[PDB]
Design a protein around this nucleic acid. Structure first.
Ligand SMILES: [Cl-]
Ligand SMILES: [Cl-]
Ligand SMILES: [Mg+2]
Ligand SMILES: [Mg+2]
Ligand SMILES: [Mg+2]
Ligand SMILES: [Mg+2]
Ligand SMILES: [Mg+2]
Ligand SMILES: [Mg+2]
Ligand SMILES: [Mg+2]
Ligand SMILES: [Mg+2]
Ligand code: NA
Ligand code: NA
Ligand code: NA
Ligand code: NA
Ligand code: NA
Ligand code: NA
Ligand code: NA
Ligand SMILES: [Sr+2]
Ligand SMILES: [Sr+2]
Ligand SMILES: [Sr+2]
Ligand SMILES: [Sr+2]
Ligand SMILES: [Sr+2]
Ligand SMILES: [Sr+2]
Ligand SMILES: [Sr+2]
Ligand SMILES: [Sr+2]
Lengths: 154, 95, 186, 140, 160
RNA sequence: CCUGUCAAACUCCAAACUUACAGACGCUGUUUGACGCGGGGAUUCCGGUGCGCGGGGU
RNA sequence: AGUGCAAGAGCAAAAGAUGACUUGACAGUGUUCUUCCCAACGAGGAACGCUGACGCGAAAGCGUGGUCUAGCGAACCAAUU
RNA sequence: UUAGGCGGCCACAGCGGUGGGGUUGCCUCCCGUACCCAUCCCGAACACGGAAGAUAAGCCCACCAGCGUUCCAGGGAGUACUGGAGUGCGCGAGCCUCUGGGAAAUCCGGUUCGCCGCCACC
């Protein structure tokens, strides 16, 4: 399971790339989705490689992000341990987070919005013109590397 | 194109590779297809009779009946539905 | 053979056994082929339909399995030809085959020949094959009159082994009668 | 082994290449059978502008008709070494050509399942000289 | 005409003589120089002139560089010295010129050029150890009459 | 035999890629009716630029 | 090689060659593709049928002109069946 | 299939070459033209009739890789080329990095001297 974050806008972006991001329920900049690791899903993130930031999150980080940025399928309601317990198949946030990582279920399947609408990176990102291997913030990240971005986008 | 004829720009598609030269094997020329069957349209360069317009080479149509010995195959050209009269010699089964 | 551009003919064409141009025309009918072959000492007659991995033979008759019914004469002639054709057509009727088309292969369509006699046999067995009556031999040459009248120009016998002297085309009549019988183990 | 390997005469082809007939009579009388007309291909400037037109005649002789011709034809010519084919045939003279081969040439000349004769069963120039020399004449 | 009109490889490959007529002959005299009877393997030293950029060199430049290279080898080693130089590239690409304004713009044939890729050997001379600094100078004069910057690479020279 | 080079109108080879149909996931539609069909009204048929690939031309 | 003519393509017990016979280069009416990719538009063209009558062949079968892609013309008026 | 008939794929099956195999069996060559039929001339072929002889051809069987071919290994090569991205470099031509794909030639070594279907048959 990888976490996708659109870091580049829609203007001048190819339509077939734009539509892939819309298929991955990600419509704005700084938005985040939890995409599984299939052949079909990998073909999609590879096509989005230059306009996104992906990698596998740590259980600790996924939890932090879900607590602060997860929303129900409809409404303002804060997703806390009590919300999870009353609406999901799990006990707390950790139980849901473990399931998302082990690819047992999806946010949509549990009545949550497939999008974790994040805040801009505190202290800023490493740049949207170069990949991670060149010192930027585009493409595939380390598990420790994606956390730094996901946590900065609390 | 310098001309709008049927065989315009068809040097490649309507020519055989040297080893596939000469008369084609009869087994495929007398193949029996049933209605609803998905078939692959590809002209055999060795067979003169029963062809279609080269623009449809590569289509995968659906057999919807026959007209004499030739088959009436339903395809979709872009967005327009078309019915192609073609013999078995230029058809292969799907899957 | 020479290089990459060289075109090696289809196997049964290198072997000079199949006329692929005539085969395509034969298969166009949809009807099963009555394969009529002839060897020096023998005559073969098969009923072949088209299959997925090659041809299928549903009924056949070789002139060697003719002696199983009472033949004591040679097997590569006109009376033998008809009978091998009748025996093929009869087994065909038992297989559920009703109509056919004559495949003479690489043989010549010479009037009154053995391959046309094989066809006359199958027609008389109950099979519906598109023919032409005046391209077949007159009933006596099918019976074996030409051979008996060659033994009339005797001095020395025509046959080596002891079948008979003046030859009997009556054996043909007796054998056609044996096969026309409703009983018989086919 | 030897019986199905010993050479025989296939055909004795006698021909006269003129270029414009009256000479059909002399072939029929010397051979024993009927002659056939010979046409030509391509337009030539030596007043031979017509394609399908009689140039000469030929007669293909087989079996007894072949031997009964050669008993009177061979003494009319002094046979040489360089006058032989790689396949074991020879032409002399009025042209008289003799085709020689081993007892299984039907395999190459038939319709059903024909095959060309292997180089190990084909006749040699030496095996050709030896056969005709063993039939009333000399070599060299 | 300047080489600026023909040095780049931006045009399609135009070589098919069966469709191109009126092509001027090559100004190049010979590609094989020196002792063309002796082998290339008979020499301990092999030095090649390598082109650094991907360019199109005209027949006139190929000749002008070959001439001023071989003339130095003839001056220093004699007309029958123990060397052999080869010009391995041939002028295959046909050149046009539009010489009426831009209407019917496809030009008439004016010459021939050689498409040389970067890193390719234009010249290759085979010599003996003592004559090595003469051939390195023949190439220094030759690279001055073509379009790209060049390398003088010694392929069989452990003698230094 | 050896040795030196080429191809828009060459090919013993041969991609990336584009493309037909189908399945799967995704997304989407069944009160926001998609896909589609029928009808009313247009405007429009001087375009331009970047990037990629081009063809012509110094 | 040859296959009437550009060019590209097809063809070897043939689509080439020879020989013989024959007039389907037939009448009627269509389905379909093309002309006009997609996507509307005539004439023209082609593929593929059927009806009627025929030719050849032992027969399956082949013949809706020439192996395939150029060789074409509305209304009105006239002549013609 | 102790030698057969009709095929499918249509060179992995082609070209070339070596060894073996046939008494009433098979396939051939073979023997022979009264007939059916046959050659613009020839029973050569085609067609018909038949076994005196043979395994030399063919064919069937086993095998050889020199040539052509199929596929694979390792090297060439993750090179050539390339879909996506870049306020990376270069006067420029062009190059480079990241991401997703990925040849061809040639060399060396293996493979390949057909596979499969129906039928009939000591
Ligand atoms: Cl069509
Ligand atoms: Cl036969
Ligand atoms: Mg909401
Ligand atoms: Mg700040
Ligand atoms: Mg920045
Ligand atoms: Mg092309
Ligand atoms: Mg008017
Ligand atoms: Mg008139
Ligand atoms: Mg043997
Ligand atoms: Mg710059
Ligand atoms: Na073919
Ligand atoms: Na002007
Ligand atoms: Na679906
Ligand atoms: Na416009
Ligand atoms: Na029309
Ligand atoms: Na004549
Ligand atoms: Na044998
Ligand atoms: Sr340009
Ligand atoms: Sr002007
Ligand atoms: Sr320079
Ligand atoms: Sr394209
Ligand atoms: Sr035609
Ligand atoms: Sr004979
Ligand atoms: Sr400059
Ligand atoms: Sr790979």
């Amino acid at each position: 399971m990888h976490a996708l974050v659109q870091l580049r806008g829609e203007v001048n972006m190819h339509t077939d790339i734009q539509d892939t991001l819309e298929m991955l329920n990600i419509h704005h900049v700084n938005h985040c989705t939890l995409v599984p690791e299939t052949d079909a899903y990998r073909g999609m993130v590879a096509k989005v490689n230059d306009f996104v930031a992906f990698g596998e999150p740590s259980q600790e980080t996924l939890e932090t992000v879900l607590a602060t940025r997860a929303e129900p399928l409809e409404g303002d309601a804060d997703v806390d341990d009590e919300w999870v317990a009353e609406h999901t198949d799990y006990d707390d946030i950790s139980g849901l987070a473990f399931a998302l990582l082990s690819e047992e279920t999806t946010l949509r399947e549990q009545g949550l919005s497939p999008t974790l609408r994040l805040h801009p990176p505190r202290g800023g990102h490493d740049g949207v013109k170069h990949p991670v291997k060149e010192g930027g913030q585009l493409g595939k990240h380390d598990t420790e590397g994606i956390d730094d971005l996901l946590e900065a986008m609390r | 194109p310098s001309s709008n004829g049927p065989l315009e720009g068809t040097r490649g598609k309507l020519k055989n590779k040297p080893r596939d030269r000469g008369t084609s094997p009869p087994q495929r020329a007398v193949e029996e297809f049933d209605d609803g069957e998905k078939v692959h349209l590809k002209i055999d360069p060795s067979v003169p009779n029963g062809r279609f317009h080269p623009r449809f080479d590569g289509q995968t149509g659906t057999v919807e009946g026959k007209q004499g010995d030739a088959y009436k195959v339903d395809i979709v050209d872009g967005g327009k539905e078309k019915t192609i009269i073609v013999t078995a010699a230029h058809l292969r089964r799907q899957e | 053979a020479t290089g990459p551009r060289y075109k090696v003919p289809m196997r049964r064409r290198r072997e000079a056994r199949t006329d692929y141009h005539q085969r395509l025309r034969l298969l166009k009918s949809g009807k099963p082929r009555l394969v009529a072959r002839k060897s020096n000492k023998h005559v073969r007659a098969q009923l072949v339909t088209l299959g997925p991995n090659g041809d299928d033979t549903l009924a056949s008759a070789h002139s060697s399995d003719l002696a199983e019914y009472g033949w004591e004469a040679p097997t590569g002639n006109m009376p033998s030809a008809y009978l091998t054709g009748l025996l093929a057509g009869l087994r065909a009727q038992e297989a559920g085959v009703e109509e056919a088309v004559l495949d003479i292969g690489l043989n010549s369509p010479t009037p009154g020949s053995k391959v046309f006699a094989i066809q006359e046999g199958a027609i008389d067995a109950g099979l519906d094959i598109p023919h032409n009556d005046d391209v077949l031999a007159d009933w006596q040459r099918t019976r074996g009159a030409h051979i008996a009248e060659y033994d009339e120009q005797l001095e020395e016998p025509l046959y080596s082994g002891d079948f008979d002297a003046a030859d009997l085309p009556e054996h043909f009549d007796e054998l056609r009668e044996t096969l026309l019988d409703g009983d018989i183990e086919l | 082994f030897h019986e199905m390997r010993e050479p025989r005469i296939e055909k004795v082809v006698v021909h006269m290449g003129i270029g414009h007939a009256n000479a059909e009579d002399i072939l029929g009388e010397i051979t024993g059978q009927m002659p056939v007309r010979t046409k030509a291909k391509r337009t030539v400037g030596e007043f031979d502008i017509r394609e399908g037109d009689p140039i000469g005649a030929k007669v293909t002789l087989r079996d007894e008709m072949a031997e009964e011709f050669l008993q009177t034809a061979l003494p009319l010519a002094e046979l040489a070494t360089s006058q032989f084919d790689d396949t074991g045939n020879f032409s002399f003279g009025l042209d008289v050509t003799v085709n020689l081969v081993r007892p299984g040439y039907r395999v190459a000349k038939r319709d059903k399942a024909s095959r060309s004769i292997p180089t190990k069963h084909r006749l040699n120039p030496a095996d050709a000289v030896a056969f005709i020399e063993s039939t009333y004449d000399v070599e060299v | 005409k300047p080489a600026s009109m023909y040095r780049d490889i931006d045009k399609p490959a135009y070589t098919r003589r069966e469709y191109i007529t009126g092509i001027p002959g090559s100004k190049i005299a010979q590609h094989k120089m020196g002792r063309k009877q002796k082998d290339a393997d008979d020499y301990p030293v092999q030095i090649s002139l390598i082109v650094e950029e991907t360019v199109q060199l005209r027949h006139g430049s190929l000749e002008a560089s070959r001439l001023s290279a071989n003339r130095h080898l003839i001056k220093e080693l004699g007309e029958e010295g123990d060397y052999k130089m080869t010009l391995r590239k041939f002028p295959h690409q046909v050149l046009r010129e539009n010489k009426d304004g831009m209407r019917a713009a496809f030009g008439k044939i004016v010459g021939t050029a050689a498409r040389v890729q970067a890193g390719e050997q234009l010249f290759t001379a085979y010599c003996n150890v003592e004559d090595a600094e003469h051939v390195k100078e023949a190439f220094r004069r030759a690279y001055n009459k073509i379009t790209p910057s060049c390398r003088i690479k010694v392929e069989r020279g452990e003698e230094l």
